[PDB]
Amino acid sequence: VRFLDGHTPAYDLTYNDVFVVPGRSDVASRFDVDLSTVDGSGTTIPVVVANMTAVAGRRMAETVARRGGIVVLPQDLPITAVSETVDFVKSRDLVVDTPVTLSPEDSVSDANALLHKRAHGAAVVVFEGRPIGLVTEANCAGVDRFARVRDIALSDFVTAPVGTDPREVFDLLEHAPIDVAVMTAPDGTLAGVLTRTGAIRAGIYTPAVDAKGRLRIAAAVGINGDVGAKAQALAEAGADLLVIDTAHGHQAKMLDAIKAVASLDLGLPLVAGNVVSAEGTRDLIEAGASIVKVGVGPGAMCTTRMMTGVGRPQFSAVVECAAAARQLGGHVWADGGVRHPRDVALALAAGASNVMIGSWFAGTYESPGDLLFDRDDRPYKESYGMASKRAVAARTAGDSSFDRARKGLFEEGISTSRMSLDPARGGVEDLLDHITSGVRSTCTYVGAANLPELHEKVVLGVQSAAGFA
Amino acid sequence: VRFLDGHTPAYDLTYNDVFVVPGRSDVASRFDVDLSTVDGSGTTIPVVVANMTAVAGRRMAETVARRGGIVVLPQDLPITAVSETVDFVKSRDLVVDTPVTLSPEDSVSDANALLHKRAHGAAVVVFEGRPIGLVTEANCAGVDRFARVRDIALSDFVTAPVGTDPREVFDLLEHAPIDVAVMTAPDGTLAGVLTRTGAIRAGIYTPAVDAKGRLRIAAAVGINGDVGAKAQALAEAGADLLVIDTAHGHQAKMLDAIKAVASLDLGLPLVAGNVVSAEGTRDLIEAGASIVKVGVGPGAMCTTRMMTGVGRPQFSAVVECAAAARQLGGHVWADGGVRHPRDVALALAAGASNVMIGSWFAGTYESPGDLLFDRDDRPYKESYGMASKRAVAARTAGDSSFDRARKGLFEEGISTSRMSLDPARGGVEDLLDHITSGVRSTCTYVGAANLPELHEKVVLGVQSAAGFA
Amino acid sequence: VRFLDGHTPAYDLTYNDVFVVPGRSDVASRFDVDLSTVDGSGTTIPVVVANMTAVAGRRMAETVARRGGIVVLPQDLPITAVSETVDFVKSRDLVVDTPVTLSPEDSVSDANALLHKRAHGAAVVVFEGRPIGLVTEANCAGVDRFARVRDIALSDFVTAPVGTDPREVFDLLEHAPIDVAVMTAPDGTLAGVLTRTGAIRAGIYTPAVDAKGRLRIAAAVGINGDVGAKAQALAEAGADLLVIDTAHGHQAKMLDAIKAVASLDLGLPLVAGNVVSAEGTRDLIEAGASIVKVGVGPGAMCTTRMMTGVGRPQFSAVVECAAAARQLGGHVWADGGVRHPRDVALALAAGASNVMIGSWFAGTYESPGDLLFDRDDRPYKESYGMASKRAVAARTAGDSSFDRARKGLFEEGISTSRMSLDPARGGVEDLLDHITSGVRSTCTYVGAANLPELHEKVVLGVQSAAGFA
């Protein structure tokens, strides 16, 4: 990277200690920017969803993959569930989305509970596979709790055939009372749903697909047990990317696991982490990893940094790791608690080929967790970090209760977090457009048409802490 | 600029990281300081009002121009409205101010609503053009809401002829029950109003006027469409200054627009922005711009800096841009969210020929927006940044709803802000005197009689962030 | 009236000290009850709106008269305004209602302010008299305050010709996105609006009309000045009913005024009040009054009862006055602060031919006052009793300020009241249906098909104060 003259700080830099200086630009608008990645993951946007139990679901995976991103499934998930989720994701369409199906005999409470897990705002009542009507919010509210779906269902709705151009659908929905545009297969049965915003997004985001034209998806593995067997099973299960993640990735056990997985030669890229040192990046790459995750205790007040004085500011760590990987011909991923689009933009400018997003996406409809309401009626969803204490306890396989309790004694608390959900941008796509708009604006300001040029022609600076007063 | 020995920081500086060291002074008082600018804008004070829809009105323009400042009208305003506003501003007097005219049949609520858009605190009832009386606050309050103006109007008021010396008016108002001093033309009809504070200010501030003796005013243009046609139309409409503004001013499109406007040779100075780099300043000046705006993402927690890691601290950017412009024989303007008089003083000391003020003036009576009251009865006025989403959507001309929604998807939220109004200093002049007093005190401390000497003989220093604890 | 055996209380009774005992009933449903009055006022429901400045408006008069009620205009209103209001009311239709007309150039704030004075929830934009579209709440909210009507107007709306059956309109609006059903004259211009609820009510309420088929309306007069001249002028102005009202109606001045008005023989019924004694009722009737108002200081904690120990419980006063009037062949009206439908039902059962409603209707959209919002955003409207202090001061004609202040010294305070507006039932009709439903349920419980039978076959009881603990 390039810094302004005289900017040679005597400390590591974080995202709050740097800024991007605008330069000569030839890009007309944001849409003239290509966000495709060159790390081999096949993502058309620099967004990856973290392998967190409270975030990495099936609806989340489908929604993110349809918009060009990728998702890594939790490493503790059973193999059968992993295969089922992979099949479900790869069985979806690239243009239309799976709506919520409600039985006419279902209760109003169950109706709204099943309604609030998608961003469409409506659910389709299905009888033998054919739509009868739509039920929306403010229609099931204020009515008797003993009522049923059939007593509030609206039989008038928009219908279009599959294969219709998104522009035609948007034009049709210009006077529709409900923005939903449920689509029926030529047989007549439900074959997905479309929305005007979804129709618009269909022309902006290029879905990420494999050689078979199916949405890509990733799975995670640990460093305990037979790593090679689990990796091979996941590869046979349909996983496109494999991630080996742990708190400290520079230990010899991770090197052994990486060598074991690379020996099988599954023909897929390997993502290993996390390290914050150039030596760790080189060691991981030489072990047979093509992508290296970065970020250990990136926050100055995070749990890891309070428990241990171990960590590193994200910006300098990413810069050094990316430089080492490029020297060795690899790529890096920028983990470490992304919270604003500025984080994604600066991570990309520092040299990261992709960015990993965790707890931010927890507070969304598409997340696997159930939607909760606080004392002030404001929606929220709980977060449990990488995994819950029960999850790791089960991950420790069959062991005597004495050994399990002995191992869990040193384990810290669950550290559950209540992730608020923004009413205006509660959908996952409502955050993806935000992040992509930020990145595109950064690219236009720099004057780069794609991420490699963004990294090549970026000029950075350093600011003091007096500007935050 | 000059810094103390040993002050060579390894980072860009902001307004909180610098201070002015007092030096030998020969200036007796603040009034012995000349605040005239040399940028060619004709302003007698270093204050310019930003081209914001919620700030740049007609009353605001008149009030600011009467006190020596200038105002830039919004770029999205219709040409007919621009011409009407220019004619209204140029048809005003340089000493007396236009009061509020109330019909005797008007309602009390309408009376106070029309009263609260001026700082005089009184409104003149007009019948065939002759005053009958005055209505003030606390007179229409506590009465029946069905009452009318004639039922609360006070027929006793002070009257003086036009052309009377302000000192005589102030002496006359020494025992007047109401400080208002409504002035009648020799015919008898209303020809403006005067106030003791206004009379005093008439002897301090020199109004900014053109060769015809009429108040100056400015208009803004974009970089989309036929820039030359709009610039020529505005010049013919009576605009004195032209401003070409966009988020990123170093792009080739801005250079093309500047060349197009300069080719017509309208005989007016051109203000272009915004840039934070010396290269951008040189490119803009060589393209045919005499004044360059500065400031992109100046705050470390602003919307631009959170969405993108793009920006620069205001002080260093202003210093570098001013140095480049002086090397090329130009001038610069200091934008970037002025909030305290310290900002204006430091911007002037850094080398800026003028300062641009935006959202600060939104919370004033003279602003075009309507006055609102919060839950705690405290007055406030809303702010919408440079323009509202509807404004830019209309600015995109006639386009299909699909394209408009597609373009607006990446657009961020309205980001409306509730700008509180200070009861003690709610008037625009009540902020202008504050800012000018700060600047004059800075000049006396430095020991400079005018802004060029302020820039020439200023000594600065650097402080750490530990002083803000 | 009939009381249960042994109920001979040693005190006057109020509405809280009595109840109606159900009896044998042959009425099937509420709709089988006739609410027509026999007092000669021509009202089809036992509801009369009090002559209060904050209630008796023009929209209020139209809305109440369309539903079978009558309204008495304030006595302090100018004769020209009275004639204009009478013409406006008599120029309206008996089926459709006058909507709100908004100019396309009007502001959003003005749009919603003009929208919130009617219960339809929508306003019609008019250009040369032809509708272009509809603007509703939640459409003008959340948008730029600088926007205009044309920028938010919806051009799609329901249209039907005048004369269409209300049942057809209701059937048409079954799938309409907006419940409004604006009606166009055969020429094409606006000729009123209709609503599904309004269409339903058109078949329940019989509008009150005179011999010419126009909506009836009433006006009030005082006892000061030339009462005969004002009464004759109001009769010529189109007023249908004349009311002579004052705090104490048994004084000789009221008798003189009644004799003066009756001498002219205007051919209209005379309503005089207020009295609470049988002697006062007889004296007022013999003076030439066909209807006598009842109720002086009816509340035990009202302003009149706190200032003076003068008053009487409403129930016993109404019973005695009605008995005296029936003995003399007259009728009585039940004033005295109606707040619940129980009050109307008990007043009718006691022998009152009609009921007068005052401050209750102040908190409605149709009231002349402007809608206000409190600290908790809850809507409300101010009340000023019979008249404001300014109103009575002006009513005292042209007198020296000394005499006016001397007369107003003993006058109590304005006693303004903040009448809350119920969001669910904010419309006047939304209270009329409530009151009429209460009265119809009372009639069904008693077993009476009309008010005379309600008075004839009612059995009452007495309860102690221990039931309110």
Side-chain angles (χ1 to χ4, degrees):
Chain A
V1 293
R2 262 211 54 211
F3 283 98
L4 296 179
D5 304 59
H7 294 197
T8 323
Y11 48 84
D12 277 291
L13 304 171
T14 176
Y15 289 152
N16 303 261
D17 270 296
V18 291
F19 52 86
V20 176
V21 182
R24 171 67 77 92
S25 178
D26 261 339
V27 184
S29 60
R30 305 173 184 176
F31 300 94
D32 303 331
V33 183
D34 184 58
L35 300 180
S36 299
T37 62
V38 288
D39 55 5
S41 60
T43 59
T44 80
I45 57 175
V47 166
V48 177
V49 178
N51 48 271
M52 280 161 52
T53 62
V55 181
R58 73 186 331 150
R59 310 190 307 269
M60 165 74 58
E62 174 193 3
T63 310
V64 170
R66 173 142 54 247
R67 302 311 173 194
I70 200 177
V71 178
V72 187
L73 294 176
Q75 64 155 230
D76 65 349
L77 217 67
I79 198 94
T80 61
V82 166
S83 181
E84 178 180 356
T85 309
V86 168
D87 292 24
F88 174 109
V89 167
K90 291 186 175 299
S91 62
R92 295 292 139 264
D93 191 71
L94 328 179
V95 201
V96 303
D97 171 288
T98 297
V100 180
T101 67
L102 267 175
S103 180
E105 312 89 17
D106 219 359
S107 280
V108 167
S109 324
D110 301 303
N112 66 37
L114 271 293
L115 182 102
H116 271 318
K117 30 178 56 45
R118 287 279 184 168
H120 315 98
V124 184
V125 304
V126 278
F127 177 94
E128 84 185 326
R130 279 142 264 294
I132 296 68
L134 281 207
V135 57
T136 47
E137 204 174 4
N139 170 24
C140 33
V143 317
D144 184 11
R145 281 196 113 248
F146 291 94
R148 328 206 68 65
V149 180
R150 96 172 53 73
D151 267 345
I152 56 180
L154 176 60
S155 300
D156 196 5
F157 56 82
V158 179
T159 308
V162 183
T164 308
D165 193 294
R167 172 63 174 276
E168 188 49 28
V169 166
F170 184 89
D171 298 327
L172 188 178
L173 293 147
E174 294 204 14
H175 293 351
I178 310 299
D179 90 328
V180 194
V182 37
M183 291 206 148
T184 39
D187 188 307
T189 58
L190 188 69
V193 70
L194 205 78
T195 297
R196 48 194 312 174
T197 37
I200 279 183
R201 290 193 260 247
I204 305 176
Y205 307 97
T206 282
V209 291
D210 62 333
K212 316 301 180 34
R214 304 169 298 178
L215 299 179
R216 314 172 82 102
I217 191 175
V221 293
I223 58 168
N224 288 349
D226 205 328
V227 286
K230 295 174 281 171
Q232 164 153 60
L234 289 181
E236 272 145 30
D240 180 350
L241 205 57
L242 300 164
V243 182
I244 318 177
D245 42 18
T246 194
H248 189 17
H250 202 188
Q251 51 192 352
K253 189 151 54 180
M254 177 73 87
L255 303 180
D256 297 358
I258 290 167
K259 289 183 166 112
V261 177
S263 99
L264 308 189
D265 182 14
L266 262 45
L268 302 178
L270 284 185
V271 189
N274 302 31
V275 301
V276 307
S277 210
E279 176 182 357
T281 309
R282 294 190 185 99
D283 292 359
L284 260 60
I285 284 176
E286 292 181 5
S290 34
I291 301 177
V292 181
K293 278 174 59 176
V294 185
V296 169
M301 282 154 322
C302 68
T303 305
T304 305
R305 197 80 78 90
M306 291 286 128
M307 292 295 278
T308 77
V310 182
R312 191 170 187 182
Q314 193 67 17
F315 187 82
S316 302
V318 164
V319 164
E320 163 156 338
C321 289
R326 290 184 183 276
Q327 212 60 4
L328 252 58
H331 308 283
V332 311
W333 279 12
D335 204 358
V338 166
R339 191 46 63 112
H340 297 93
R342 172 205 60 181
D343 306 359
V344 182
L346 291 176
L348 294 175
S353 303
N354 221 330
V355 180
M356 196 151 198
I357 304 179
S359 179
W360 193 8
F361 287 164
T364 48
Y365 292 146
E366 285 76 3
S367 64
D370 299 301
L371 197 130
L372 273 43
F373 294 92
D374 73 331
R375 182 182 179 182
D376 302 333
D377 154 32
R378 265 172 81 211
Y380 73 102
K381 288 191 172 180
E382 294 179 350
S383 181
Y384 311 128
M386 222 37 76
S388 302
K389 304 305 165 181
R390 190 278 315 242
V392 295
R395 203 144 79 237
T396 56
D399 225 308
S400 58
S401 61
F402 171 82
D403 298 334
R404 224 161 61 241
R406 177 174 180 269
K407 187 132 64 193
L409 178 69
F410 278 162
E411 197 45 281
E412 41 273 39
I414 187 173
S415 302
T416 182
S417 325
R418 279 146 72 97
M419 291 285 328
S420 180
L421 183 141
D422 185 296
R425 65 171 84 278
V428 156
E429 308 143 340
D430 301 325
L431 303 174
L432 285 173
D433 44 8
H434 198 234
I435 298 165
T436 49
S437 147
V439 178
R440 291 178 189 277
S441 299
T442 294
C443 293
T444 54
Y445 272 119
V446 176
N450 48 22
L451 310 185
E453 289 158 35
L454 168 62
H455 176 27
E456 280 155 23
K457 61 203 326 201
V458 68
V459 168
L460 299 157
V462 186
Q463 59 174 353
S464 178
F468 295 88
Chain B
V1 292
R2 262 211 54 211
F3 283 98
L4 296 179
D5 304 59
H7 294 197
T8 323
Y11 48 84
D12 277 291
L13 304 171
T14 176
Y15 289 152
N16 303 261
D17 270 296
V18 291
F19 52 86
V20 176
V21 182
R24 171 67 77 92
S25 178
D26 261 339
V27 184
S29 60
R30 305 173 184 176
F31 300 94
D32 303 331
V33 183
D34 184 58
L35 300 180
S36 299
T37 62
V38 288
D39 55 5
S41 60
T43 59
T44 80
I45 57 175
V47 166
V48 177
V49 178
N51 48 271
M52 280 161 52
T53 62
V55 181
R58 73 186 331 150
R59 310 190 307 269
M60 165 74 58
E62 174 193 3
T63 310
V64 170
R66 173 142 54 247
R67 302 311 173 194
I70 200 177
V71 178
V72 187
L73 294 176
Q75 64 155 230
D76 65 349
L77 217 67
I79 198 94
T80 61
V82 166
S83 181
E84 178 180 356
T85 309
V86 168
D87 292 24
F88 174 109
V89 167
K90 291 186 175 299
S91 62
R92 295 292 139 264
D93 191 71
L94 328 179
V95 201
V96 303
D97 171 288
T98 297
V100 180
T101 67
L102 267 175
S103 180
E105 312 89 17
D106 219 359
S107 280
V108 167
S109 324
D110 301 303
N112 66 37
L114 271 293
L115 182 102
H116 271 318
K117 30 178 56 45
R118 287 279 184 168
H120 315 98
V124 184
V125 304
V126 278
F127 178 94
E128 84 185 326
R130 279 142 264 294
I132 296 68
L134 281 207
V135 57
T136 47
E137 204 174 5
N139 170 24
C140 34
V143 317
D144 184 11
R145 281 196 113 248
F146 291 94
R148 328 206 68 65
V149 180
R150 96 172 53 73
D151 267 345
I152 56 180
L154 176 60
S155 300
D156 196 5
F157 56 82
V158 179
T159 308
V162 183
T164 308
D165 193 294
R167 172 63 174 276
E168 188 49 28
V169 166
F170 184 89
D171 298 327
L172 188 178
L173 293 147
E174 294 204 14
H175 293 351
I178 310 299
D179 90 328
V180 194
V182 37
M183 291 206 148
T184 39
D187 188 307
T189 58
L190 188 69
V193 70
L194 205 78
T195 297
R196 48 194 312 174
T197 37
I200 279 183
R201 290 193 260 247
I204 305 176
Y205 307 97
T206 282
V209 291
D210 62 333
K212 316 301 180 34
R214 304 169 298 178
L215 299 179
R216 314 172 81 102
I217 191 175
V221 293
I223 58 168
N224 288 349
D226 205 328
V227 286
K230 295 174 281 171
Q232 164 153 60
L234 289 181
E236 272 145 30
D240 180 350
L241 205 56
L242 300 164
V243 182
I244 318 177
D245 42 18
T246 194
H248 189 17
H250 202 188
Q251 51 192 352
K253 189 151 54 180
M254 177 73 87
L255 303 180
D256 297 358
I258 290 167
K259 289 183 166 112
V261 177
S263 99
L264 308 189
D265 182 14
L266 262 45
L268 302 178
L270 284 185
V271 189
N274 302 31
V275 301
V276 307
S277 211
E279 176 182 357
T281 309
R282 294 190 185 99
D283 292 359
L284 260 60
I285 284 176
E286 292 181 5
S290 34
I291 301 177
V292 181
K293 278 174 59 176
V294 185
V296 169
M301 282 154 322
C302 67
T303 305
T304 305
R305 197 80 78 90
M306 291 286 128
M307 292 295 278
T308 77
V310 182
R312 191 170 187 182
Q314 193 67 17
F315 187 82
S316 302
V318 164
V319 164
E320 163 156 338
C321 289
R326 290 184 183 276
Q327 212 60 4
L328 252 58
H331 308 283
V332 311
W333 279 12
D335 204 358
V338 166
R339 191 46 63 112
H340 297 93
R342 172 205 60 181
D343 306 359
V344 181
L346 291 176
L348 294 175
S353 303
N354 221 330
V355 180
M356 196 151 198
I357 304 179
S359 179
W360 193 8
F361 287 164
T364 48
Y365 292 146
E366 285 76 3
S367 64
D370 299 301
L371 197 130
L372 273 43
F373 294 92
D374 73 331
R375 182 182 179 182
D376 303 332
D377 154 32
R378 265 172 81 211
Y380 73 102
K381 288 191 172 180
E382 293 179 350
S383 180
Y384 311 128
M386 222 36 76
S388 302
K389 304 305 165 181
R390 190 278 315 242
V392 295
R395 203 144 79 237
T396 56
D399 225 309
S400 59
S401 61
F402 171 82
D403 298 334
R404 224 161 61 241
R406 177 174 180 269
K407 187 132 64 193
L409 178 69
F410 278 162
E411 197 45 281
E412 41 273 39
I414 187 173
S415 302
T416 182
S417 325
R418 279 146 72 97
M419 291 285 328
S420 180
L421 183 141
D422 185 296
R425 65 171 84 278
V428 156
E429 308 143 340
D430 301 325
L431 303 174
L432 285 173
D433 44 8
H434 198 234
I435 298 165
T436 49
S437 147
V439 178
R440 291 178 189 277
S441 299
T442 294
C443 293
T444 54
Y445 272 119
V446 176
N450 48 22
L451 310 185
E453 289 158 35
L454 168 62
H455 176 27
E456 280 155 23
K457 61 203 326 201
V458 68
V459 168
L460 299 157
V462 186
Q463 59 174 353
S464 178
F468 295 88
Chain C
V1 293
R2 262 211 54 211
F3 283 98
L4 296 179
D5 304 59
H7 294 197
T8 323
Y11 48 84
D12 277 291
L13 304 171
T14 176
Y15 289 152
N16 303 261
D17 270 296
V18 291
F19 52 86
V20 176
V21 182
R24 171 67 77 92
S25 178
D26 261 339
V27 184
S29 60
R30 305 173 184 176
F31 300 94
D32 303 331
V33 183
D34 184 58
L35 300 180
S36 299
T37 62
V38 288
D39 55 5
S41 60
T43 59
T44 80
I45 57 175
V47 166
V48 177
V49 178
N51 48 271
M52 280 161 52
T53 62
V55 181
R58 73 186 331 150
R59 310 190 307 269
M60 165 74 58
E62 174 193 3
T63 310
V64 170
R66 173 142 54 247
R67 302 311 173 194
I70 200 177
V71 178
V72 187
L73 294 176
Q75 64 155 230
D76 65 349
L77 217 67
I79 198 94
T80 61
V82 166
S83 181
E84 178 180 356
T85 309
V86 168
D87 292 24
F88 174 109
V89 167
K90 291 185 175 299
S91 62
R92 295 292 139 264
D93 191 71
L94 328 179
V95 201
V96 303
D97 171 288
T98 297
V100 180
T101 67
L102 268 175
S103 180
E105 312 89 17
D106 219 359
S107 280
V108 167
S109 324
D110 301 303
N112 66 37
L114 271 293
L115 182 102
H116 271 318
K117 30 178 56 45
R118 287 279 184 168
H120 315 98
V124 184
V125 304
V126 278
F127 177 94
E128 84 185 326
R130 279 142 264 294
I132 296 68
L134 281 207
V135 57
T136 47
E137 204 174 4
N139 170 24
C140 33
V143 317
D144 184 11
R145 281 196 113 248
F146 291 94
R148 328 206 68 65
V149 180
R150 96 172 53 73
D151 267 345
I152 56 180
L154 176 60
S155 300
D156 196 5
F157 56 82
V158 179
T159 308
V162 183
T164 308
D165 193 294
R167 172 63 174 276
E168 188 49 28
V169 166
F170 184 90
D171 298 327
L172 188 178
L173 294 147
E174 294 204 14
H175 293 351
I178 310 299
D179 90 328
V180 194
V182 37
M183 291 206 148
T184 39
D187 188 307
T189 58
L190 188 69
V193 70
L194 204 78
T195 297
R196 48 194 312 174
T197 37
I200 279 183
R201 290 193 260 247
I204 305 176
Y205 307 97
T206 282
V209 291
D210 62 333
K212 316 301 180 34
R214 304 169 298 178
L215 299 179
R216 314 172 82 102
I217 191 175
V221 293
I223 58 168
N224 288 349
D226 205 328
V227 286
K230 295 174 281 171
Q232 164 153 60
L234 289 181
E236 272 145 30
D240 180 350
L241 205 56
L242 300 164
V243 182
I244 319 177
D245 42 18
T246 194
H248 189 17
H250 202 188
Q251 51 192 352
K253 189 151 54 180
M254 177 73 87
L255 303 180
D256 297 358
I258 290 167
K259 289 183 166 112
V261 177
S263 99
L264 308 189
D265 182 14
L266 262 45
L268 302 178
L270 284 185
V271 189
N274 302 31
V275 301
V276 307
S277 210
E279 176 182 357
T281 309
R282 294 190 185 99
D283 292 359
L284 260 60
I285 284 177
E286 292 181 5
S290 34
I291 301 177
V292 181
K293 278 174 59 177
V294 185
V296 169
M301 282 154 322
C302 68
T303 305
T304 305
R305 197 80 78 90
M306 291 286 128
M307 292 295 278
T308 77
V310 182
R312 190 170 187 182
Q314 193 67 17
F315 187 82
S316 302
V318 164
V319 165
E320 163 156 338
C321 289
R326 290 184 183 276
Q327 212 60 4
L328 252 58
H331 308 283
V332 311
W333 279 12
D335 204 358
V338 166
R339 191 46 63 112
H340 297 93
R342 172 205 60 181
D343 306 359
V344 182
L346 292 176
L348 294 175
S353 303
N354 221 330
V355 180
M356 196 151 198
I357 304 179
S359 179
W360 193 8
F361 287 164
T364 48
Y365 292 146
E366 285 76 3
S367 64
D370 298 301
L371 197 130
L372 273 43
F373 294 92
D374 73 331
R375 182 182 179 182
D376 303 333
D377 154 32
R378 265 172 81 211
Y380 73 102
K381 288 191 172 179
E382 294 179 350
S383 181
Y384 311 128
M386 222 37 76
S388 302
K389 304 305 165 181
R390 190 278 315 242
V392 295
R395 203 144 79 237
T396 56
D399 225 308
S400 58
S401 61
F402 171 82
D403 298 334
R404 224 161 61 241
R406 177 174 180 269
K407 187 132 64 193
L409 178 69
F410 278 162
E411 197 45 281
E412 41 273 39
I414 187 173
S415 302
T416 182
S417 325
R418 279 146 72 97
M419 291 285 328
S420 180
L421 183 141
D422 185 296
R425 65 171 84 278
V428 156
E429 308 143 340
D430 301 325
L431 303 174
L432 285 173
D433 44 8
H434 198 234
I435 298 165
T436 49
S437 147
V439 178
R440 291 178 189 277
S441 299
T442 294
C443 293
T444 54
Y445 272 119
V446 176
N450 48 22
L451 310 185
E453 289 158 35
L454 168 62
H455 176 26
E456 280 155 22
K457 61 203 326 201
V458 68
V459 168
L460 299 157
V462 186
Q463 59 174 353
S464 178
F468 295 88

